[model samples]
Target: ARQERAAQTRRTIVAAAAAVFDELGYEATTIAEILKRSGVTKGALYFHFTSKEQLAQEVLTSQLRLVLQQIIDETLLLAQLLSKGDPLVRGSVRLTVEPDGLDRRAPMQEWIGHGRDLLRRAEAGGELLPRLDVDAVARMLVGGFTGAQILSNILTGHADLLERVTDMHRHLMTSVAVPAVLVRLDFSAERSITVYDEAMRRREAPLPAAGDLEH
Candidate 1:
């Protein structure tokens, strides 16, 4: 029971810190703000985290792991749906790009690397054009998608982000995919909404019994 309580307290502190970091950014976010938000004592906070930097580091690491999974699972989901669509993913993107005194480049590098791997596989499978440069395409896709989201956020408050990303993939794939493969691909924004809705519904559903899982 004592261990459970301690873990819970740490989780609460981390959660509160993440919220403050998102709102104020890392440099502007203070330990006092986190303590106030978490409703935990300074000693308790210090017990879990030595300083604001330590707390921020934990937050960044947690957010990166989460966002990395989301990108792997839902990069196809695109736009306002992506931003307002999922807080975990949105927070991760913001934390990675918004220069809050963290190592922002690492997450971007990982994302690009993931894209490169996927492109390489597609090339091996003959999904890409014969003469295309896989590395260049991978970098361009990551950079373009990142820029598209930022622009969408600026221009329409992310209202058009889904459409913009959808357009980006459509144009990009058209340029790189073999003509036969391009014709078979579906780059519709509506598909992202469908996928997002289905995922949410599944998330809200009740879990199965242990026996059911064993089966």
Candidate 2:
């Protein structure tokens, strides 16, 4: 019972710390601020975590675990959906655009930094389109995912979060993947142009401009 209680306190502290870090980027947040917000005493926080950096590391790890779980869940659903001839358009879009799906941008950024070795295998195996710039595409996907969630948060005040998330998912699948595959896989310029044009017409915001492409 004591161990369980201690673990619960640690988890609560970590989650509270994550929220603070996410809201006020890591560089701007302090342990005292987290302690105040979490209502966890400074001594207890220090008993479990030696420093702010260590707490941040724990938050990153927890977020990574959630992300990996999401990937696994979506991969299963995607495989089943693909088998049924579900359009890659919407399915592909939802993978990145769900509200909770991209909740931890900081952790995802950290993962991208450290997980390059794993990512290289995906790049080499053509899991990503060969013609697209790998680093740019990766950054786009990550940023798009985070941006979609932020949009959901802002537009709904967290009430209609899932609805906005669904719309963004559909927007992405229809706008990004289907057209890219049509061009990259089959080199179908006409179909790509048609899809791209239609997506641009329907989008609430413009398709990312050339200047918007991240490094």
Candidate 3:
């Protein structure tokens, strides 16, 4: 009961800190504001975190770490979805690069790095033209995806995000992919919805019991 209460208090402090940080930004947020929002005593807040700076650092690292983990999972899942096409993959990509109301450029860099690694592999396999710049192409792909998501969000309330991403990939592949490879690439918008539906079906399926596992 003591441990549970301590955990709850920590959560309360973190939640209060997150709220204040969001409303006022990190530089402007104060310990007083967090205390007011949390309705916790000074001793309680300081018991979990030594100083306001430490509290702020915890807030920044904790929040972004979760977001980063989700992006990492989505990035890997995206590789699975790409061949079949999935707008949720695009949506995940957008989230990684352009999460709402956060200075999240680092995730974009991480994504660009992932793309560059893939492009390098493709180049080594002779999938790309001799003179193509893999780094430039990767950056362009990330940037183009970001732009397409924003435009789609504004114009269609993201109802057409899948189609916009499909068009963007089609245009980009035409420019970057070798003619032979391009011929077999799938960028159909319908495929995105199909993959999403299939994924949802799998998610809704029940998990096997622990006792059902093989030895």
Candidate ordering by TM-score (highest first): 1, 3, 2
Candidate 3 lDDT by residue in tens digits, 47-147:
78877756654554442222222222332234444333333333233334322244445545566777787777777777776797878988887666667
Displacement of residue 157 (Cα, Å) in model 3 is 0.5
What residue pairs clash in candidate 1, if any at all?
79-161, 79-162
Cα lDDT tens digits for candidate 1, 1-215: 66666666776777777678777776788889877766777767777887786666676555222222233235565353356645334545567566445666665666667777777777777777788777788787767777888898789987777777767767777788788777666665565667777766643312222221211
> Which ranges in model 1 have alpha carbons more than 4 Å from their true place?
1-18, 31-73, 78-80, 201-215
Q: For model 2, where is the 10-residue window of minimal lDDT?
A: 205-214
Q: Model 3 — which ten-residue stretch has the worst lDDT? A: 63-72
Clashes of 3: 0
Task: Report, for every candidate in turn, its global Cα lDDT versus the true structure.
Answer: 0.64, 0.47, 0.57
lDDT of 1 at 80: 38
Clashes of each: 2, 0, 0
Q: Which lDDT value does model 2 have at 197?
A: 50
* Colliding residue pairs in candidate 3: none
Can you give the lDDT of residue 69 in candidate 1? 25
C-alpha positional error of residue 1 in candidate 2 after TM-score superposition, expressed in Å: 12
- Top model number, TM-score: 1
Residue 164 miss distance in model 1 (angstroms): 1.0
